[PDB]
């Protein structure tokens, strides 16, 4: 039952907030890999591009916290 726990959600939020420079609660696709590296993951470039093409299906090159949480849950 991969249910993200409250502590796992908090650690993800602190890491997500570090790349939110304007306090808008969102991060760009180019900073996703760095957030992942700060979270303890080592993704390849092709895996990063695929994660980018899925979250930006409409084409706005930006990721909000809930979309980031859903990508995390699918990877767990």
UniProtKB/Swiss-Prot annotation:
Keywords on record: Acetylation, Calcium, Metal-binding, Methylation, Repeat
Record has Repeat as a keyword: yes
Note in the entry: This protein has four functional calcium-binding sites.
Organism: Xenopus laevis (African clawed frog)
Name of the protein in its database record: Calmodulin-1
Residues included from the entire protein: 3 to 77 of 149
Molecular-function GO term, any one: signaling receptor binding
Known function: Calmodulin acts as part of a calcium signal transduction pathway by mediating the control of a large number of enzymes, ion channels, aquaporins and other proteins through calcium-binding. Calcium-binding is required for the activation of calmodulin. Among the enzymes to be stimulated by the calmodulin-calcium complex are a number of protein kinases, such as myosin light-chain kinases and calmodulin-dependent protein kinase type II (CaMK2), and phosphatases.
EF-hand domain segment(s): 7-42, 43-76
